[PDB]
Write a protein that binds this ligand. Sequence first.
Ligand SMILES: CCCCCCCC(=O)O
Ligand SMILES: CCCCCCCC(=O)O
Ligand SMILES: [Fe+3]
Ligand SMILES: [Fe+3]
Ligand SMILES: [Fe+3]
Ligand SMILES: [Fe+3]
Lengths: 285, 285
Amino acid sequence: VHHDGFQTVKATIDWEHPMFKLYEKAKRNGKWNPADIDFSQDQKDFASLTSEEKISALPLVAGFSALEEAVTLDILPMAHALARQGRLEDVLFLTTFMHDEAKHVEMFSRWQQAVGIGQMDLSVFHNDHYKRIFYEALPEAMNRLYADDSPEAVIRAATVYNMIVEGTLAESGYYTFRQIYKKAGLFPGLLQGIDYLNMDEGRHIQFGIYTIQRIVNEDERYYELFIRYMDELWPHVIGYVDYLTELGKRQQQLARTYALEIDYDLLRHYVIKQFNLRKKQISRT
Amino acid sequence: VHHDGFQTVKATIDWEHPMFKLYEKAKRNGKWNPADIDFSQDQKDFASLTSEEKISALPLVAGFSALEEAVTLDILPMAHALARQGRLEDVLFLTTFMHDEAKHVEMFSRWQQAVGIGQMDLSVFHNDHYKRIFYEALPEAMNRLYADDSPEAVIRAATVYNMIVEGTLAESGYYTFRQIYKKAGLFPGLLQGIDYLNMDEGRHIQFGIYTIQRIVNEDERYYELFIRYMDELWPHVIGYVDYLTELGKRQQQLARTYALEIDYDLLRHYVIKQFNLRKKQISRT
Ligand SMILES: CCCCCCCC(=O)O
Ligand SMILES: CCCCCCCC(=O)O
Ligand SMILES: [Fe+3]
Ligand SMILES: [Fe+3]
Ligand SMILES: [Fe+3]
Ligand SMILES: [Fe+3]
């Protein structure tokens, strides 16, 4: 379908648009390159583990590698729908979003390669709840935007992607990585990568908050849709958390070897806390 | 539609894929930020011009600002179609492509703002041939990919976008900018921007060559489709070139003021040369 005009021919960028400002920050804070991370110490750490200590870390890496890959692919329909509404500054920012996610995919794949599990298929650690969110509901809600860009549809896409997948699960995964392996002194390259990912994620979540809030602001009834879509996904959120928890409670040789009181009750409550504070960043009014 | 698996969970990135290597180079060579360009000298240059010297430079800026904006929006369907075919490394690279184009839009808009023409609507310098390529045929060929990702459709999208819009028109515009204003000592910020754009453009054109060649390689008959779609667009290419040429031949006060023998016959032959060497970068075999 045709371009009727061009904003930067008729006028300029809206330099005060929040998403143009977030775009600017993304360029400033987005220079990191996963190709510069030194994973040589991670290779040695991983090889030094027992086979039982080795399994301990694979579930979380499985959940993240697919997370990053899903969101790299699944942001495209959001950029399309906003482009078609003429929201140029949103699109500018989203180019940084998509590129961040490509780096995230790259970072986890480089780690798997470097530690020697690239040839191992980690799909086994995706249980039914994980598959529901990442194999199904995330691509459903995003691909919807190709044919339905109603406020309802846009809110639901930003809820699943930015508020749940990123704002709840990814954020809790970053915390979990630090609580466990940063305590242990293991896997320094991977944790440098996690620190960069977590910084990028702040912008991703702010795009979701801005997107959701700008639609709530038009019609306070969309607040309820937001809460509702958060609650609809919680069962799968926690059911993946319990599944990982059981996996860790059954494989505790890395816990004992490195003197890590892995506090699953505290990881669980951090997930709960993430979920509820994402709610509280959307004002009904 | 659902993800069946994830390549970086089952395996890794194909680290030897040409588009993964181009992605890597894009990160290394893609750090420039239009927000760092100093346009203060451009503001003074532009204000020092006569009204007749002022008009001289606006057509080319009009053609480019819409070019960058069109290609920022219109690359999205290519990333989608390749994502859906599972071509992960292509997608990784294309995130750098889309972000480059956002910076290109940004660069021209910052110049217009800084020199004081942001509020002026430059659409008047888009004649009928330009509108056919950029308002119509480019978005048609790209949006097609949402519903038809046949080799025919992919070849035609890369021909219009990478080989014509970028590989022929943009490349000739860069040359034209240097031949004219770099000679004059005018507009140093803008020309720094053009140098960065031209570097980015090399990767864009190589994605198009790779994309077109990998389909030609399957079936040598697609070579003819390539040539044919190049020839179909040439009339509008040159008809925009003639239109700009007449505009410059009629407004030659900037030419005289800065002692610039503007050689339109040489700009024309450079456009012709670009068009033909893009053909010669696709091997029929
Ligand atoms: C203790 C397990 C809870 C952490 C959530 C991990 C989310 C993810 O890995 O994508
Ligand atoms: C002498 C005019 C020929 C240069 C082609 C300019 C292409 C563009 O401005 O997008
Ligand atoms: Fe990510
Ligand atoms: Fe993210
Ligand atoms: Fe460009
Ligand atoms: Fe380009």
